[PDB]
Amino acid sequence: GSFVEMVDNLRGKSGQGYYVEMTVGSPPQTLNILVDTGSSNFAVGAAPHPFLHRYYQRQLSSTYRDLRKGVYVPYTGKWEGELGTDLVSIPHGPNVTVRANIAAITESDKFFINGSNWEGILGLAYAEIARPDDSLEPFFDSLVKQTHVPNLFSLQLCGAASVGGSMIIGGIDHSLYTGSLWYTPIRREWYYEVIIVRVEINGQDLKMDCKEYNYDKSIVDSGTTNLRLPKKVFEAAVKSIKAASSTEKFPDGFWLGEQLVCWWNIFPVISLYLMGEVTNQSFRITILPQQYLRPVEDVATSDCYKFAISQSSTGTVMGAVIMEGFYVVFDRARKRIGFAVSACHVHDEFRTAAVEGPFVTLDMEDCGYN
Numbered sequence: 170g171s172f173v174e175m176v177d178n179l180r181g182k183s184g185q186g187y188y189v190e191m192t193v194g195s196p197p198q199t200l201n202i203l204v205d206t207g208s209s210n211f212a213v214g215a216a217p218h219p220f221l222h223r224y225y226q227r228q229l230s231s232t233y234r235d236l237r238k239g240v241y242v243p244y245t246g247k248w249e250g251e252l253g254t255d256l257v258s259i260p261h262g263p264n265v266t267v268r269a270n271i272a273a274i275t276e277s278d279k280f281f282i283n284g285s286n287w288e289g290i291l292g293l294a295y296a297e298i299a300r301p302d303d304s305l306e307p308f309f310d311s312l313v314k315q316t317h318v319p320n321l322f323s324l325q326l327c328g329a330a331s332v333g334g335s336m337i338i339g340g341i342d343h344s345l346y347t348g349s350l351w352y353t354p355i356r357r358e359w360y361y362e363v364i365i366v367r368v369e370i371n372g373q374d375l376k377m378d379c380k381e382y383n384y385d386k387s388i389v390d391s392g393t394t395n396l397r398l399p400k401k402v403f404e405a406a407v408k409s410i411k412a413a414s415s416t417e418k419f420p421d422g423f424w425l426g427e428q429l430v431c432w433w434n435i436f437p438v439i440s441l442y443l444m445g446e447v448t449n450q451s452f453r454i455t456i457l458p459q460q461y462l463r464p465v466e467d468v469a470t471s472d473c474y475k476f477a478i479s480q481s482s483t484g485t486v487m488g489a490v491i492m493e494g495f496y497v498v499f500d501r502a503r504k505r506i507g508f509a510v511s512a513c514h515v516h517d518e519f520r521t522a523a524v525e526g527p528f529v530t531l532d533m534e535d536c537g538y539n
């Protein structure tokens with residue numbers, strides 16, 4: 170209900186993600202760690218990459234144990250490291266110390282951000298996508314196995330430049346949201362996979378076969394900035410967003426994220442309906458242009474914004490563009506994810522982000538890709 174010591178334990182800069190302070194080893198080494206519900210490894214800088222403020226020094230730790238195994242993790246950047254275990258704690262988190270797997274990062278490319286204040290990543294998703302395989306127990310799994318911390322965590326990510334928010338570990342803080350929580354099932358415990366059953370732009374249904382909304386999956390990912398949509402869905406959404414915002418024209422490159430525009434009510438709300446807890450029942454989460462038109466503050470050659478909805482080949486990714494609207498409860502114990510209106514979300518006098526239900530939606534199981 171109330172975890173005041175964990176409130177406001179997240180920091181970041183716009184476009185660089187949200188991080189939490191952790192300690193690794195004995196005596197404790199303080200590191201800032203990106204909170205990532207889209208991956209499953211605890212991986213920290215362990216060598217003096219010039220972009221890093223701090224890094225894990227295994228030689229200074231008496232509780233370090235070598236697993237004598239390496240791991241190589243390419244993405245569409247990359248990183249490589251050495252697997253071990255050590256004692257891990259979260260200063261503005263529950264009062265516990267856990268022995269966790271750590272990938273000591275020894276080489277990387279396009280992974281760390283030049284100018285950011287974090288030097289590792291906390292993968293909070295499930296073992297099935299852990300590298301090199303599902304035998305490497307993710308951090309949160311170790312946390313639950315070794316303590317009486319309940320098997321859930323919740324995230325309030327606050328946008329718009331410093332950002333902040335809260336990671337409530339083992340519970341929910343009711344001051345972080347307004348109205349009620351609405352829950353969608355976690356379809357499979359790998360990513361935080363969910364099913365989208367309907368899409369509306371300013372209340373107008375896109376009218377697509379709902380399978381296309383989830384081709385080939387839909388996930389909830391704090392480690393991605395954009396709302397990413399499958400190519401066909403993105404196509405249809407931009408078309409509809411263009412129509413709704415017709416009073417001004419804009420170049421095609423802007424909608425494709427290939428150029429910024431410099432200059433809210435011009436733009437429509439976007440609603441995703443998610444599978445509910447009950448047969449034939451759904452609910453709707455709604456975001457504003459405040460969430461999906463993101464300011465780009467680092468423009469030396471210019472008040473510019475990037476269109477932060479983009480096309481994807483890996484499915485829908487509900488990134489920061491979605492999560493900044495909402496308090497999001499990752500209720501692992503019950504295989505579900507709760508959304509509520511965030512008490513910190515950016516909005517105006519006319520429109521607010523919303524979570525509403527129940528709605529009647531048939532054939533919701535058919536929306537999943539197999």
Ligand SMILES: C[C@@]1(c2cc(NC(=O)c3cnc(OCF)cn3)ccc2F)C[C@@H](C(F)(F)F)SC(N)=N1
Pocket residue numbers: 181182183184185186187205206207208244245246280282290390391392393394489
């Ligand atoms: C592990 C990986 C990854 C994420 C990031 N994330 C950011 O830099 C970032 C920036 N801003 C954000 O919000 C706005 F503030 C959020 N997150 C960086 C490196 C990285 F490796 C992999 C990423 C993937 F796309 F390569 F798969 S996605 C993914 N889920 N995890």
